[PDB]
Amino acid sequence: MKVRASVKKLCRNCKIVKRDGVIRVICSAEPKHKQRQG
Amino acid sequence: AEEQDAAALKQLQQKSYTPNGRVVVEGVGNLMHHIARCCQPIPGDEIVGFITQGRGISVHRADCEQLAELRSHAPERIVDAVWGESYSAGYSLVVRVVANDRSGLLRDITTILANEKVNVLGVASRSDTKQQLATIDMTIEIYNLQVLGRVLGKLNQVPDVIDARR
Amino acid sequence: MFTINAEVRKEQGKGASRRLRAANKFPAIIYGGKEAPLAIELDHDKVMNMQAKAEFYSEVLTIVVDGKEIKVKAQDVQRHPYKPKLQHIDFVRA
Amino acid sequence: MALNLQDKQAIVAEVSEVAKGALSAVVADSRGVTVDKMTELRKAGREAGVYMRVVRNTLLRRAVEGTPFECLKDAFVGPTLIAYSMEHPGAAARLFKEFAKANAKFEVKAAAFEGELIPASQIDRLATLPT
Amino acid sequence: MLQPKRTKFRKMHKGRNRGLAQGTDVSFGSFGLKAVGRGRLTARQIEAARRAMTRAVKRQGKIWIRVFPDKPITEKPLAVRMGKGKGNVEYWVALIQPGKVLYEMDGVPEELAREAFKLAAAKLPIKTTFVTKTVM
Amino acid sequence: AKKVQAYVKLQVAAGMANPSPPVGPALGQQGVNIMEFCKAFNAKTDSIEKGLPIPVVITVYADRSFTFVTKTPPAAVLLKKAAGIKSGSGKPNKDKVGKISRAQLQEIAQTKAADMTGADIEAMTRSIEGTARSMGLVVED
RNA sequence: AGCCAGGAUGUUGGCUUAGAAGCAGCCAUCAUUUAAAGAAAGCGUAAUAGCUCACUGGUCGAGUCGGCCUGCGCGGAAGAU
Ligand SMILES: [Mg+2]
Ligand SMILES: [Mg+2]
Ligand SMILES: [Mg+2]
Ligand SMILES: [Zn+2]
Ligand SMILES: [Zn+2]
């Protein structure tokens, strides 16, 4: 889990999603890519 | 800093280094000649020799601008020819290498130039103020066109080098 | 080619202009030839849309105002400094 | 895909083709190949040239839209994957059974070779043709 | 770094940065990086931006740097009290109003240019928006 | 006719029997032996000409040997002895290296017509021309 | 948008390289059979191969796509009795 001010779709398989009012990149293709806003 | 040091060392080395079948003009070998610096033919796509008043003949490489001018002025001094038997040494390649100047690019370039079997006769060097573009002309000596090509390729391979030509 | 709908301004001045801008309009003016200058408002968005093309700038445009199809070329435009907007337009009659 | 005009043009072309012809057949490459594309197309080429379009575009409002103009019975073929093959030279040519043959010799399926229209026929392996 | 080669005066007053820019249009190039945000671009920042954008483009197509850091900003050293005259010029700045086109760019695709200007924008301390060479 | 089992076009000049440096591991990657590409390979090669690369289908079945049918050599190697110059691309538009006429190209085309997947010969000819252009030879129409 | 197929031929375009076969890169970047298929967008190989994509036809039956405009909001946002 990266936790950034800036979360971004790092590939096409990266998907932005808001959970508990928290922007999160979640990616099936690469688990490095998964992020959080914090 | 290390890179800079390396570059300096390379330069020093170059300096230290610095410190007749060749061209058969028109079916008669052993003619007093020399390669012109306007464009320096090796195994080039044909050559032409301007019969000078002093210092014999100046070989120009065929389809040169200076040579064309000379022809226009007076055609009778010019003589078309073959590139002889290929002189054992076959010297004279100036290679202009344009590159983006970071802290340790020139050094890298120098390093790459070394190791390869090339006699570095001179290295002209400057950083252009139009951007931060390091530009360098290596007066080098080598035995074939293929070899030159290989060298060029190698130079290119160092990714900071933008373009490398004569 | 381009039919622009214009209305004559009852109030001219800085404040008036500002107000117009706020209400999604903007002041323009027509001039040229023997006729007097005619200061109008223009509905902004439409004008903006029109002026995305160079056709608009080149060609003669029809400003309709009080039932008069005035044939004018756009002469000079004041764009807003840091926003995709139009402060004001000048129109020369062709 | 391009708007209105191109499609219309295509339709017109199709209609024209239909007008200059008679016998036809169907094919559905649900799991075909571009190698198997170059059997039917190749055959067509051999026969004459480019004219014979496979025109795979069997929409309810595209190829079926042009059907009211010439030969109304083809509207029922519309649904599912289909490619209409119109024939020009020779009245009732050999191209009807060709498809069937292809299907037989490795092409998964061929729209159940139901055929098109000469006596308003249906799924029949008609060997009787001019030869 | 961009800096005046010679000057009348070494030290300049703070002044103020109220108003909008004059250099508002994309004069030279095709695309422009227009400062929406008011502020002051230091020379260094500008240089960085240039590097970003040139790099981005890969030296394909020409770039302009419309703003020039012509105003010397002074500072006092640490553990220095308030009197003792005005401090020395540490760096040079360009006062940017809203509207100032900062960089222009041509000889590239639009998208590429935009990308370049994103990078450039990151470098800069002021909010910047993409603009185009408008007819008239 | 089955789909992709292990068929690939990969060999140098047909005259060069048993190519170990160029192909080597590639031709004997699967259970097919190195001995198959010399005796059987040069059987069909002697019927036409040597010194030209010609492709062939290598559908490797489980039962030792494989079925094969040779096709046609490329215009690439053809445009050297027939064309003239043996070089090509690098600087095509900046300066013309070589050039061929249309008639010659056309002539070249119809000999390959067995392998080509074309309806009309004209089409084939134009394809050939295009290829030539790509290679770096401006056609003299 | 899901779902089902194809995504070929000249061709391993040439060249340049040690090799380069859409894919170290460099340069042309065409035509063909075409419903459509880039001398190839990404992965992938020592290079081939292989796997996705663009593009295509069905399948399905209503809107969908992405700017730029501003309104309010979210994160960015950790301290001491
Ligand atoms: Mg939780
Ligand atoms: Mg006031
Ligand atoms: Mg907040
Ligand atoms: Zn990802
Ligand atoms: Zn010369």
From Swiss-Prot, chain A:
Listed InterPro entries: Ribosomal_bL36, Ribosomal_bL36_sp
Keywords per UniProt: Ribonucleoprotein, Ribosomal protein, RNA-binding, rRNA-binding
A GO MF term: rRNA binding
Pfam family of the protein (one): Ribosomal_L36
Recorded GO CC terms: cytoplasm; cytosolic large ribosomal subunit
Disulfide bond sites: none
GO BP annotations listed: cytoplasmic translation; translation
Keyword Metal-binding among record annotations: no
HAMAP family in UniProt: Ribosomal_bL36 (MF_00251)
Assembly with partners or alone: Part of the 50S ribosomal subunit.
Matches recorded under NCBIfam families: rpmJ_bact (TIGR01022)
Family note: Belongs to the bacterial ribosomal protein bL36 family.
Role this protein plays: One of the last ribosomal proteins to be assembled in the 50S subunit, it contacts a number of helices in the 23S rRNA, acting as molecular glue. The simultaneous presence of uL16 and bL36 probably triggers ObgE's GTPase activity and eventual dissociation from the mature 50S ribosomal subunit.
Protein name: Large ribosomal subunit protein bL36A
Phylogenetic lineage: Bacteria, Pseudomonadati, Pseudomonadota, Gammaproteobacteria, Enterobacterales
Gene symbol of the encoding locus: rpmJ
From Swiss-Prot, chain B:
Effect of disrupting the coding gene: A slight increase in biofilm formation in a csrA-disrupted background; when combined with a spoT disruption (a ppGpp0 mutant) there is a very large increase in biofilm formation. The ppGpp0 mutant makes decreased levels of CsrA and its inhibitory small RNAs (sRNA) CsrB and CsrC. Deletion of relA alone decreases persister cell formation in a hipA7 mutant; the double relA/spoT deletion obviates persister cell formation.
Keyword vocabulary terms for this entry: ATP-binding, GTP-binding, Kinase, Nucleotide-binding, Transferase
GO biological process: guanosine tetraphosphate biosynthetic process; guanosine tetraphosphate metabolic process; nucleobase-containing small molecule interconversion; response to starvation
MF-aspect GO terms: ATP binding; GTP binding; GTP diphosphokinase activity; guanosine-3',5'-bis(diphosphate) 3'-diphosphatase activity; kinase activity
ACT domain boundaries: 94-166
Record keyword Transmembrane present: no
The keyword Lipid metabolism is annotated on this UniProt entry: no
Assigned protein family: Belongs to the RelA/SpoT family.
Protein name: GTP pyrophosphokinase
Native organism: Escherichia coli (strain K12)
Underlying gene: relA
Parent sequence residues shown: 569 to 740 of 744
UniProtKB/Swiss-Prot annotation, chain C:
NCBIfam families assigned to the protein according to its UniProt record, in alphabetical order: PRK05943.1 (NF004612)
Gene designation: rplY
GO MF: 5S rRNA binding; structural constituent of ribosome
GO cellular component terms given for this protein: cytoplasm; cytosol; cytosolic large ribosomal subunit
Keywords: Ribonucleoprotein, Ribosomal protein, RNA-binding, rRNA-binding
Gene3D superfamilies in the record: Ribosomal Protein L25, Chain P
CDD domains: Ribosomal_L25_TL5_CTC (cd00495)
Keyword Ribosomal protein recorded: yes
InterPro entries in alphabetical order: Rbsml_bL25/Gln-tRNA_synth_N, Ribosomal_bL25/Gln-tRNA_synth, Ribosomal_bL25_short, Ribosomal_L25_dom, Ribosomal_uL5_bac-type
Biological function: This is one of the proteins that binds to the 5S RNA in the ribosome where it forms part of the central protuberance. Binds to the 5S rRNA independently of L5 and L18. Not required for binding of the 5S rRNA/L5/L18 subcomplex to 23S rRNA.
Positions of disulphide bridges: none
Protein name, per record: Large ribosomal subunit protein bL25
SUPFAM superfamilies: Ribosomal protein L25-like
Quaternary state and interactors: Part of the 50S ribosomal subunit; part of the 5S rRNA/L5/L18/L25 subcomplex. Contacts the 5S rRNA.
Keyword rRNA-binding applies: yes
Family stated for the protein in its record: Belongs to the bacterial ribosomal protein bL25 family.
GO biological process, one term: response to radiation
Curated annotation (Swiss-Prot), chain D:
Residues found modified as N6-acetyllysine: 37, 105
Other remarks on this protein: Ribosomal protein L8 appears to be an aggregate of ribosomal proteins L7/L12 and L10.
A GO cellular-component term linked to this record: cytosol
Gene encoding the protein: rplJ
Keywords: Acetylation, Repressor, Ribonucleoprotein, Ribosomal protein, RNA-binding, rRNA-binding, Translation regulation
Organism from which the protein derives: Escherichia coli (strain K12)
Family the UniProt entry places it in: Belongs to the universal ribosomal protein uL10 family.
Protein name: Large ribosomal subunit protein uL10
UniProt superkingdom: Bacteria
Function, in words: Forms part of the ribosomal stalk, playing a central role in the interaction of the ribosome with GTP-bound translation factors. Protein L10 is also a translational repressor protein. It controls the translation of the rplJL-rpoBC operon by binding to its mRNA.
GO biological process: cytoplasmic translation; negative regulation of translation; translation
Range of the intact protein held here: 1 to 131 of 165
Gene Ontology MF terms in the entry: large ribosomal subunit rRNA binding; ribosome binding; structural constituent of ribosome
Coiled-coil zones: none
Subunit comment: Part of the ribosomal stalk of the 50S ribosomal subunit. The N-terminus interacts with L11 and the large rRNA to form the base of the stalk. The C-terminus forms an elongated spine to which 2 L12 dimers bind in a sequential fashion forming a pentameric L10(L12)(L12)2 complex. Two L12 dimers associate with a copy of L10 to form a very strong complex (called L8).
Taxon lineage: Bacteria, Pseudomonadati, Pseudomonadota, Gammaproteobacteria, Enterobacterales
